[PDB]
């Protein structure tokens, strides 16, 4: 049985992964599950799956340990980043599903690449922040990365075998890859005024017509920063630069992305927008298995729309491309600034449209820009350099926010 560690098992992605595991009992073995806040849910999962190890936040380690011994499970309990690193590099784990949101998922993603694991990547902030380091580290140790993110999973499915195996093979012109097309729903405000986004409630922004997801990715979809980040994720995953990856607005969320070839062929993945499809694909690869989705019904589709992005309205996307060209430092500035203006939007401290302002101000800040020219990809020293800039952007972005609520 393929041994699984599911980092971030209590969230949206975790739910879908587990929904597939329950359909395929004697194919996968759960070795570990992790959860930051939802201690009871993690316990309920523990009791269901009898995992060898679980990990939670340090604030909950004691509480959860009591509850696990009280339930008489053999389960080892772990806490913090230290626990995640352990599970991610555990000799007994074959496959890691990286579903921790944000930067918090970076160190365990690396540990997994360092340990040579099969990694199923949901956690895109890992690649936006440490793409060179993660891929380099993975290549060096024999880790395979398969993307779970819909768009990337689509693209991956639409790529010849040799380029799934080795992403550098994509520069051999025989394979004829021209460019990659990322589909974007346009989010909750696509078809609404600039003015109306300004006054968006969290309830409006957080709820998406086609997808049910975590809070963060949800907001990122509303501003289109999600595509931004996906743009940078794609560059690392498929070993390309941003000019080779373009974005098309597609509100139906049926077409999940395309690969354009030199002969005129666009290979695309279509499906109902349900993350069990890409998770299932990535779990069973190179085989396939039933996912439990309700399949897309082509008869009732109606009309699938396509539309160029409106960049004035979705500045987050302009700014992500700009950052992708600047390299890893600017992508960190990008992602972290954005991580901060999201905690801030959901806390109701800024407007939705303020997410763009904070992120630019951060990309164009002189104190942030000093670190753009650093070697964030050094095998020994890249990690501390990435985290230090993280802490730094955290401070400055926080400062920018406070400054804005009055004036600069």
Ligand X SMILES: O=CN(O)CCCP(=O)(O)O
Residues contributing to the site for a copy of itself (CB under 8 A): 157-158, 160-161, 174-176, 178, 181, 248, 258, 260-272, 274, 276-277, 280-281, 284, 287-291, 293, 295-296, 298-299, 301-308
Stretch that binds ligand X, among 11-19, 37-45, 148-156, 395-403 (CB under 6 A): 148-156
**Cβ pair 226, 150 in contact under 8 A:** no
Mark out the alpha helices in 142-253 (DSSP H runs).
Answer: 150-157, 161-165, 194-198, 202-206, 215-223, 225-238
Residue 250 tokens read as 């597609």
Report the site for ligand NAD in 110-139 (rule: CB under 6 A). 122-125
What's the rounded Cα separation, in Å, for the pair 87 and 52?
10
If one asks whether residue 100 binds ligand NAD (CB under 6 A), the answer comes out as yes
Strand order of the sheet with strand 2-7? 76-79, 53-56, 28-34, 2-7, 95-98, 118-121, 144-147
Nearest approach, Cβ of residue 30 and a copy of itself (Å): 20
CA distances from 181 to 55, 240, 244, 267, 393 (A): 38, 12, 9, 10, 30
Distance CA 87, CA 98 (A): 11
Residue 118 vs 208, nearer CB to ligand X: 208
Q: Select the binding partner of residue 37 from ligand X, ligand NAD, a copy of itself, none (C-beta < 5 to 8 A, by kind).
A: ligand NAD
Buried b (16+ CB within 10 A) or exposed e, 130-156: bbbbbbbbbeeeebbbbbbbbbbbbbb
The pair of structure tokens assigned to 88 is 């991610």
- φ, ψ of residue 304 to 5 degrees: the values are -90, 125
Residue 47 binds to ligand NAD (criterion: CB under 6 A): no
> Which x/- pattern, by CB under 6 A, does the window 222-261 give for ligand X?
----xx----------------------------------
* CA dist., res. 235 & res. 378, Å (int): 19
Helix (H) or strand (E) holding 267: strand 266-270
Alpha-carbon gap, residue 124 to 335, rounded angstroms: 10
Residue 104, binding choice from Mg ion, a copy of itself, ligand NAD, none, Cβ under 5 to 8 Å by partner class: ligand NAD
Binding-site partner at residue 12 among ligand NAD, Mg ion, a copy of itself, none, CB < 5 to 8 Å by type: ligand NAD
**Among Mg ion, ligand X, a copy of itself, none, what does residue 280 contact (CB within 5–8 Å per kind)?**
a copy of itself
Sign of the torsion formed by the C-alpha atoms of 261, 264, 267 and 270: positive
SS3 call for 27: coil
Contact 136, 379 (CB under 8 A): yes
Sign of CA dihedral 182, 242, 220, 129: positive
Site for ligand X (CB under 6 A): how many residues? 11
Q: Binding residue for ligand NAD (CB under 6 A) from 1, 22, 37, 207?
A: 37
Residue 290 binding partner per list a copy of itself, ligand X, ligand NAD, none, with a CB distance cut-off of 5 to 8 Å that depends on partner kind? a copy of itself
182-211: contacts with ligand X (CB under 6 A): 184-185, 187, 211
Which residue among 217, 232, 235, 255 contacts ligand NAD (CB under 6 A)? 217
Among 127, 200, 247, 275, contact with ligand NAD (rule: CB under 6 A): 275
The one segment of 212-220, 311-319, 331-339, 381-389 that binds ligand NAD by CB under 6 A: 212-220
Q: Is 221 in the site for ligand X (CB under 6 A)?
A: yes
Residues 281 and 267: their CA atoms lie apart, in Å, by 17
Nearer to Mg ion, 12 or 150 (CB): 150
373 interface partner picked from ligand X, Mg ion, a copy of itself, none, CB below 5 to 8 A per type: none
- Of these partners, ligand NAD, ligand X, Mg ion, none, which one is at the site of residue 187 (CB under 5 to 8 Å by kind)? ligand X
Q: Which does 264 bind (CB under 5 to 8 A by kind): ligand X, a copy of itself, Mg ion, none?
A: a copy of itself
Q: Give the binding range for ligand X (CB under 6 A) out of 108-116, 220-228, 290-298, 386-394.
A: 220-228
| Residue (40 or 375) nearer to ligand NAD, CB | 40
The CA dihedral of 230, 232, 238, 239, to the nearest 10 degrees, is 180
State which residue, 64 or 355, has the beta carbon closest to ligand X.
Answer: 355
Return residues touching ligand NAD (CB under 6 A): 8-14, 35-37, 99-101, 104, 122-125, 149, 213-217, 275
């Amino acid at each position: 049985l393929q041994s699984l560690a599911i980092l971030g098992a209590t969230g949206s992605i975790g739910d879908s992964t587990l929904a597939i595991i329950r359909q395929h009992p004697n194919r996968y073995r759960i070795h570990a599950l992790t959860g930051f806040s939802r201690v009871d849910k993690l316990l309920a999962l523990a009791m269901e799956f009898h995992p060898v190890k679980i990990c939670t936040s340090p604030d909950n380690y004691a509480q959860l340990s009591q509850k696990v011994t009280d339930a008489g499970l053999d389960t080892i309990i772990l806490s913090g980043d230290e626990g995640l690193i352990e599970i991610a590099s555990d000799e007994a784990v074959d496959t890691v599903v990286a579903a921790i949101v944000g930067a918090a998922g970076l160190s365990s993603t690396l540990a997994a690449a360092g340990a040579g694991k099969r990694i199923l990547l949901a956690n895109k902030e890992s690649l936006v922040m440490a793409g060179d380091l993660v891929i380099k580290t993975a290549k060096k140790h024999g880790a395979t990365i398969l993307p779970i993110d819909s768009e990337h999973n689509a693209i991956y499915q639409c790529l010849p075998a040799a380029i799934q195996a080795d992403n550098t093979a994509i520069h051999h012109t025989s394979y004829g890859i021209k460019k990659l097309w990322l589909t974007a729903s346009g989010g909750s405000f696509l078809d609404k005024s600039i003015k109306q986004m300004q006054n968006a409630s969290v309830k409006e922004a957080v709820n998406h017509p086609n997808w049910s997801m975590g809070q963060k990715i949800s907001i990122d979809s509303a501003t289109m920063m999600n595509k931004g980040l996906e743009l940078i994720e794609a560059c690392h995953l498929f070993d390309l630069k941003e000019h080779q990856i373009q974005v098309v607005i597609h509100p139906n969320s049926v077409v999940h992305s395309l690969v354009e070839y030199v002969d005129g062929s666009f290979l695309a993945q279509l499906g109902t927008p349900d993350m069990k499809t890409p998770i299932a694909h990535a779990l069973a690869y190179p085989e396939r298995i039933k996912s439990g989705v309700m399949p897309l019904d082509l008869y009732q589709l109606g009309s699938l729309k396509f539309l160029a992005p409106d960049l004035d309205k979705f500045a987050c996307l302009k700014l992500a491309r700009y950052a992708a060209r600047l390299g890893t430092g600017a992508c960190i500035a990008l992602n972290t600034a954005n991580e901060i203006a999201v905690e801030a939007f959901l806390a109701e401290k800024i407007c939705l449209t303020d997410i763009a302002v904070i992120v630019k101000a951060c990309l164009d800040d002189k104190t942030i820009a000093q670190d753009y020219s650093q070697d964030f990809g050094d095998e020994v020293l890249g990690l501390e350099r990435i985290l230090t800039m993280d802490k730094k952007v955290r401070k400055i972005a926080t400062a920018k926010i406070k400054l804005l609520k009055q004036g600069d």
